[PDB]
Amino acid sequence: SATANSMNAVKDSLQRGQSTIDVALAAGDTITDLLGKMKEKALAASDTSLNTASFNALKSDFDSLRDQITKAASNAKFNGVSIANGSTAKLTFLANSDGSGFTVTAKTLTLTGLGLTASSTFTTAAAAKTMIGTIDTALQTATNKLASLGTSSTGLDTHLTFVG
């Protein structure tokens, strides 16, 4: 009977894990929309037919979207823990009365975890042509991280049912 009662704390831990992953997925949707807009900006900027004013405008938009990405990444926390802001290598949620834990490996979404730096930009059309591939790689790794987080959440759900 004491074991059956400790199953409650187990269930509460698994639910906390799904909540943290939900906040991370919301931040991930924001970051992915911003990354697609940044790729469109760098793509338009790569053109050499643009004049200086249009190029500066596209550059300023790219920088502003960069700052919004880092802000959305830092703001993604659930009650002071986070699995996406890169503040910890891992998080471990309970799985049995004996204390064995389900493990979730953190997937960073901050600019440094995407491979971008906080001050990355392009000052010339050739730099924009490089930035297209840079943003594409960043979007790819971001989507892979979010997909792994989604699988971890579904696994926590299935274990919750089995614990019940």
Partner 1 sequence: ALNSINTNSGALIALQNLNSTNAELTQVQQRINTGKKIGSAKDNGAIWATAKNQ
Partner 2 sequence: KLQDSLDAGVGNLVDADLAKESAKLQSLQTKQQLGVQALSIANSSSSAILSLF
**Residues forming the site for partner 2 (CB under 8 A):** 12, 15-16, 19, 22-23, 26
Which lies closer to partner 1 via its Cβ, residue 76 or residue 149? 149
What is the C-alpha to C-alpha distance for residues 57 and 37, in angstroms, rounded to an integer? 14
Query: Smallest distance from the beta carbon of 40 to a copy of itself, in angstroms?
Result: 14
Q: Which two tokens stand for residue 4?
A: 């059956």
Alpha-helix residue ranges (DSSP H) falling in 46-121: 52-74, 111-114
Which lies closer to partner 1 via its Cβ, residue 30 or residue 32? 32
Query: Smallest distance from the beta carbon of 140 to partner 1, in angstroms?
Result: 6
- Helices then strands, each counted (H, E), the chain: 4, 2
- HSE-CB at 66 with a 13 A cutoff on CA atoms is 22
User: Could you give phi then psi for residue 78, rounded to 5 degrees?
Assistant: -120, 100
Stretch that binds a copy of itself, among 64-72, 82-90, 104-112, 114-122 (CB under 8 A): 64-72
CB 122 within 8 A of CB 45: yes
Tell me how crowded residue 67 is: count the other CB atoms within 10 A of its CB.
12
Which lies closer to partner 1 via its Cβ, residue 28 or residue 113? 28
What is the C-alpha to C-alpha distance for residues 137 and 141, in angstroms, rounded to an integer? 6
Asked if 164 interacts with partner 1 (CB under 8 A), we say: yes
Q: Which residues bind partner 1 (CB under 8 A)?
A: 12, 25, 28, 32, 41, 44, 53-54, 57-58, 60-61, 139-140, 143-144, 146-151, 153-154, 164
Residues near a copy of itself (CB under 8 A) are 26-27, 30, 33, 53, 56-57, 60-61, 64-65, 68, 71-72, 75, 140, 144, 147-148, 151-152, 155, 158-159, 162
